[PDB]
Amino acid sequence: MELTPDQQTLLHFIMDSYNKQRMPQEITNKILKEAFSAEENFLILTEMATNHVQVLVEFTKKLPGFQTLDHEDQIALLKGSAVEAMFLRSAEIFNKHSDLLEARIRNSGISDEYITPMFSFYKSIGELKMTQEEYALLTAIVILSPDRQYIKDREAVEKLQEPLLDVLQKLCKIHQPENPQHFACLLGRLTELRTFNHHHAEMLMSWRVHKFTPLLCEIWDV
Amino acid sequence: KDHQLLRYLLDKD
Numbered sequence: 701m702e703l704t705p706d707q708q709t710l711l712h713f714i715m716d717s718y719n720k721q722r723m724p725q726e727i728t729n730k731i732l733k734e735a736f737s738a739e740e741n742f743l744i745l746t747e748m749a750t751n752h753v754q755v756l757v758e759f760t761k762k763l764p765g766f767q768t769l770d771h772e773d774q775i776a777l778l779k780g781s782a783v784e785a786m787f788l789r790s791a792e793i794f795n796k797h798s799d800l801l802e803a804r805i806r807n808s809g810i811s812d813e814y815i816t817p818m819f820s821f822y823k824s825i826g827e828l829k830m831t832q833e834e835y836a837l838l839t840a841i842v843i844l845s846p847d848r849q850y851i852k853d854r855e856a857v858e859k860l861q862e863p864l865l866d867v868l869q870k871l872c873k874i875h876q877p878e879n880p881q882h883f884a885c886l887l888g889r890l891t892e893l894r895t896f897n898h899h900h901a902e903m904l905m906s907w908r909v910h911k912f913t914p915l916l917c918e919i920w921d922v
Numbered sequence: 923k924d925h926q927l928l929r930y931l932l933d934k935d
């Protein structure tokens with residue numbers, strides 16, 4: 701049981717692109733040094749989200765075949781995956797300063813209705829003991845979801861997503877042969893990720909008392 | 923003209 705050379709090449713492009721992602725030192729120092737209040741904590745979350753959307757665009761452009769998709773479908777895929785990819789990355793960083801970041805999130809004026817399933821998701825991500833290949837492929841599968849709103853050529857997106865699901869399943873058989881439910885538990889995280897779209901939309905609606913950044917206003921139609 | 927900054931980030935080399 702091994703990946704074919706073609707699957708190894710596809711996996712290598714995903715990993716290389718995933719490994720490039722960085723949170724700039726200017727933003728990380730703010731987590732340590734800025735004032736502790738609901739207003740300042742919310743502003744830090746906003747800045748981190750903006751940096752992550754930028755990181756998400758750069759990662760997506762290096763995904764094999766993404767730049768061959770219809771230009772407007774590229775926009776529609778980025779807009780529909782931004783929250784899901786941001787939660788998956790948050791889950792990864794939380795499961796590897798961390799005490800102060802958690803404190804800021806819990807004291808950013810965001811309701812427990814949102815915070816509770818969020819920390820519950822980070823917990824279930826941790827129990828999976830995900831490898832970096834699993835984090836990167838799940839991120840790409842989330843981005844390349846053919847069922848997002850306003851996609852014109854869905855079949856073209858299906859052609860890019862299916863081989864990634866084939867690679868992820870093969871890795872599950874190679875690395876966890878005694879746990880045949882491993883792939884199923886990863887799919888469980890895909891469906892759980894989708895629930896954060898409704899929760900995030902309710903947070904943006906109720907926050908009408910606020911400015912965000914132009915990048916966040918664009919992707920979330922604020 | 924919609925998603926001006928998102929298009930800028932996507933379209934730059």
Ligand SMILES: Cc1cc(OCc2c(-c3c(Cl)cncc3Cl)noc2C(C)C)ccc1-c1ccc2c(C(=O)O)cn(C)c2c1
Binds near residue numbers: 721723745748749793
């Ligand atoms: C850890 C976090 C939170 C975050 O929150 C952004 C938000 C959320 C919300 C919540 Cl709290 C958590 N999960 C996802 C959402 Cl979506 N809900 O509202 C907002 C804003 C818009 C107010 C945005 C971004 C990061 C983040 C991403 C990557 C890295 C990273 C690396 O790659 O090396 C290092 N660090 C410290 C990171 C932090």
